[PDB]
Design a protein around this ligand. Structure first.
Ligand SMILES: O=C1Nc2ccc(Cl)cc2[C@@](C#CC2CC2)(C(F)(F)F)O1
Lengths: 398, 551
């Protein structure tokens, strides 16, 4: 019946975040769910004397008929005291992720901090007052949960870390990441093995993530248009690679010619291009990760289902860049695709640096807030802001 | 009064509420409060204090409406700002459209409920207030239960009500009880007598917990008035909307009118306010009198006719689909009606022209849909199926090529003009034979003096001076010229990322005159291909205009 006292960042107060509207279906599922946790002592209904509140909703993470309660403690976490990364995790063949949230129900929360964990189950058309609860145990999604549980966590983990001191197990929030250079059969079985050990209590490829190369258009014949677009893309890239030169190409344009006129390249321009392709055959030197600084994930809509992104801390010094596609069935849903993208990039940022990136989403606030919850499937929620993607920024990574 | 567990209250950390002095009143008021108080004291409401209490609120005596008898009020105004914050009672209020049809409906006015609920004994002290007396010769009191005008009274009462009902609701799941203020709206699909009998059970149940409610003969009967509507148990109608006809129309009158007409535009079709609104231009005072114009005197008249029309509606049937159909009622203006059965509307509404920097129909339509979707999740916890005046091909073309994440729930095209379209589309490749304008524009960061022009293949050109302009204004100006001094197919190369992006987004409405003009020119052309090149480079054509727009 022990309880480590947890407090809010000095002078801070509990979160009073409003509950967005939920669908009948998500409400029903949540009433079932909460009634259960209430019976088991996990939570308890609260009174009006508690003025704090946190948003909650329901999801279905990868192939599930049954719903999962999800609480957005982002604001509570940003207000919770601080507490206290094996680069080996990133440098693995495969890395599997595990949801250990359940573990937390086992631990009771410092009763004085409970008031802050207050959340509400809305009623359709406001016909009824919302149902108010607060946690009695450690809530999943709370930055303090993993911490206060570390102690017990490590314990239950030693056995597997001693039996297999070749695998890396990193925990982030409610997730546990395990990476090993084994082969799949033995790897997935060794995993199933870990979930066996975990149960008697309560598929990514890292060597594949990098800074993708900027490729330049090659064609039989070049028009004035073609050269301009070419020079534009290059001129931008000069920002990342000062060596990049466009003198020769610009010359080919001297004069106010038609846009479609076919321009014959010179031996000089061809060298100029030859030379730039080479400057671009690799990422710009001297780009290192700074832990004392925020990670930033920028995404641009390429269209047709494609989305390029760059993770970075300082402008033009990409720590990583990429593209995301397909996801059959989402063939007509920009929000699904974007949400999947953000998750894919978060997990990735977690693996690599063990922290989430602040997102810059090319979407209108309203659009994203209406539906993103309908396609979320993680236990965590990164931070984000909305933007108006530059016409350029796109043709460049395109 | 009630025997329900009090709620634990505390004063905002640190703060404490003892002070604000007694407002000496006449001898008629001092004794007209000495009386009323002696009353409450007995009922167990207030408790003559003094024992140990430094806190104090001022009592007043106001002429009770229609009474030669006096009534009291207590300024907790101070006490409240020192009182902890509570969980908001929820200000999102039920809308007729979300109600389910019922056979019988009753409304139980719990009214005198604040004084029926126990206050946190532990906190009572903080309520103290006094009654003055000639020659300060000595009356000190403090509440024992929720006080009329205290911060937590509503919140704490509402919560007590929820608890007290909890059992009854588990017992009678076929009965619907809606809380709101001191009111209880109970509806059911039972037979009239069966229903009347459950109410009595409810009333006595509430009375067991000390909450007195009205008799079946003191009850108020349907329809009930709800934020503008008349609520019947099987349907709803709109309270008549009477427009006054006067010879004197101060500014105020004109506004309130517009105000009511706006509220009416949601429910009624074809309401207009354009000319009543014109009447407020340059007004100098609220009391000012403005003569209604001819067209003003007219729409007002045509609006009265419309307001006579009786508008009825239907409630929600969970077993049927939700369908929302939208209409473009002008640029940026949309109309919508949500229904389940053709012509039997649950709700209707209007979204006014959102006037921003630059959009277009498809985008505008998209926001409309997002709006109706959120409204619906709220009202019904469901998203309607949409019937939109746009082709899957246009939507297909728009999104497939738009730079932002955009989406629209299950929807169906409905051919009901005026339709939403893309008024023009930029070429994806240069145009052969079409002329080629290399535009540019510039301005000083100190004088705001700018030049904007172009140079083209075919020798044609033209520069022009601007005053009080910016880089972005001149750059856009440049493109306008080109669209003017050009044929029906044009290739334009600009160095303005600004200009580019605004246009790339193919807008059909803006609040900038210039932008609007260009939009027009754009709609006109047969083929337009817009291109961008980096600003100050030796890039043929662009270096040329960079020369002319530099003095
Ligand atoms: O769900 C329904 N159906 C309904 C139908 C007709 C009427 Cl007049 C009233 C209702 C009701 C309510 C309410 C207050 C919000 C107004 C009731 F609770 F049943 F009373 O909510």
């Amino acid at each position: 019946i022990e309880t480590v006292p947890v407090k809010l960042k000095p002078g801070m107060d509990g979160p009073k975040v409003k509950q967005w509207p939920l669908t009948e279906e998500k409400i029903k599922a949540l009433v079932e769910i909460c009634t259960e946790m209430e019976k088991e002592g996990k939570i308890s209904k609260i009174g009006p004397e508690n003025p704090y509140n946190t948003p909650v909703f329901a999801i279905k993470k990868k192939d599930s008929t049954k719903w999962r309660k999800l609480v957005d403690f982002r604001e509570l976490n940003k207000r919770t005291q601080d507490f206290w990364h094996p680069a080996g995790l990133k440098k693995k063949k495969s890395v599997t992720v595990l949801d250990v949230g359940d573990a937390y129900f086992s631990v009771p929360l410092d009763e004085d901090f409970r008031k802050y964990t207050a959340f509400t189950i809305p009623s359709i058309n406001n016909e009824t007052p919302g149902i108010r609860y607060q946690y009695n145990v450690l809530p999943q999604g709370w930055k303090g949960s993993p911490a206060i549980f570390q102690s017990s966590m490590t314990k239950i983990l030693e056995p597997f870390r001693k039996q297999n001191p070749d695998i890396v197990i990193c925990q982030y929030m409610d997730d546990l990441y395990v990476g090993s250079d084994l082969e799949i059969g033995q790897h997935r079985t060794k995993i199933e093995e870990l979930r066996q050990h975990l149960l008697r209590w309560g598929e990514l490829h890292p060597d594949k993530w990098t800074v993708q190369p900027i490729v330049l258009p090659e064609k039989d014949s070049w028009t004035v248009n073609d050269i301009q677009k070419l020079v534009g893309k290059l001129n931008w890239a000069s920002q990342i690679y000062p060596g990049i030169k466009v003198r020769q190409l610009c010359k080919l344009l001297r004069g106010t010619k038609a846009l479609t006129e076919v321009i014959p390249l010179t031996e000089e321009a061809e060298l100029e291009l030859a030379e730039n392709r080479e400057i671009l055959k690799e990422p710009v030197h001297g780009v290192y990760y700074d832990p004392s600084k925020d990670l930033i994930a920028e995404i641009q809509k390429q269209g047709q289902g494609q989305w390029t992104y760059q993770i970075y801390q300082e402008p033009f010094k990409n720590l990583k860049t990429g593209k995301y596609a397909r996801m059959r069935g989402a063939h007509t849903n920009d929000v699904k695709q974007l949400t999947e993208a953000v998750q894919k990039i978060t997990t990735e940022s977690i693996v690599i640096w063990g922290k989430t990136p602040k997102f810059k989403l090319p979407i209108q606030k309203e659009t994203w807030e209406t539906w993103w919850t309908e396609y979320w499937q993680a236990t965590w929620i990164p931070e984000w802001e909305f933007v108006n993607t530059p016409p350029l920024v796109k043709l460049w990574y395109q | 009064i009630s025997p329900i567990e009090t709620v634990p209250v505390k004063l905002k950390p640190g703060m404490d509420g003892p002070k604000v002095k007694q407002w000496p009143l006449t001898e008629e008021k001092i004794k007209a409060l000495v009386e009323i108080c002696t009353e409450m004291e007995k009922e167990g409401k207030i408790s003559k204090i003094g024992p140990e209490n430094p806190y104090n609120t001022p009592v007043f005596a106001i002429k009770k409406k229609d009474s030669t008898k006096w009534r009291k009020l207590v300024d907790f105004r101070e006490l409240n700002k020192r009182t902890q914050d509570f969980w908001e009672v929820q200000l999102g209020i039920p809308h007729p459209a979300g109600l389910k049809k019922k056979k019988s409906v009753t409304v139980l006015d719990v009214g005198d409920a604040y004084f029926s609920v126990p206050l946190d004994e532990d906190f009572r002290k903080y309520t103290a207030f006094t009654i003055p007396s000639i020659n300060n010769e000595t009356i000190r009191y403090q509440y024992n239960v929720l006080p009329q005008g205290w911060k937590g009274s509503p919140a704490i009462f509402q919560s007590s009500m929820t608890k007290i009902l909890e059992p009854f609701r588990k017992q009678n799941p076929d009965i619907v009880i809606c809380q709101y203020m001191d009111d209880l709206y109970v509806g059911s699909d039972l037979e009239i007598g069966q229903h009347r009998t459950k109410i009595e059970e409810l009333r006595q149940h509430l009375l067991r917990w000390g909450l007195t409610t009205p008799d079946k003969k003191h009850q108020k009967e349907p329809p009930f008035l709800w934020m503008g509507y008349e609520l019947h148990p099987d349907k709803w109608t709109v309270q008549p909307i009477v427009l006054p006809e006067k010879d004197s129309w101060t500014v105020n009158d004109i506004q309130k009118l517009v105000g009511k007409l706006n509220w009416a535009s949601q429910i009624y079709p074809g309401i207009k306010v354009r000319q009543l609104c014109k009447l407020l231009r340059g007004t100098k005072a609220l009391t000012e009198v403005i003569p209604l114009t001819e067209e003003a005197e007219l729409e007002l008249a045509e609006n009265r006719e419309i307001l006579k029309e009786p508008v009825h509606g239907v409630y929600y049937d969970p077993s049927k689909d939700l369908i929302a159909e939208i209409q473009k009622q002008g640029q940026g203006q949309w109309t919508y009606q949500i229904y389940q059965e053709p012509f039997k509307n649950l709700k209707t509404g209007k979204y006014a022209r959102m006037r921003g920097a630059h959009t277009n129909d498809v985008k505008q339509l998209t926001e409309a849909v997002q709006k109706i979707t959120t409204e619906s999740i709220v009202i019904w916890g469901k998203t309607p199926k949409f019937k939109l005046p746009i082709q899957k091909e246009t939507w297909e073309t728009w999104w497939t090529e738009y730079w932002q994440a955009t989406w629209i729930p299950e929807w169906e095209f409905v051919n009901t003009p005026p339709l939403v379209k893309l008024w023009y589309q930029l070429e994806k490749e240069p145009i052969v034979g079409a002329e080629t304008f290399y535009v540019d524009g510039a301005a000083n960061r100190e004088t705001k003096l700018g030049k904007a022009g172009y140079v083209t293949n075919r020798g044609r050109q033209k520069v022009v001076t601007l005053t009080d302009t910016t880089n972005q204004k001149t750059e856009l100006q440049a493109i306008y010229l080109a669209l003017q001094d050009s044929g029906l197919e044009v290739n334009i190369v600009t160095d303005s990322q600004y200009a580019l992006g605004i246009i790339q987004a193919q807008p059909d409405q803006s609040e900038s005159e210039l932008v609007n003009q260009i939009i027009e020119q754009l709609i006109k052309k047969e083929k337009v291909y817009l291109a961008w090149v980096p600003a100050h480079k030796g890039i043929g054509g662009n270096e040329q205009v960079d020369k002319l727009v530099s003095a």
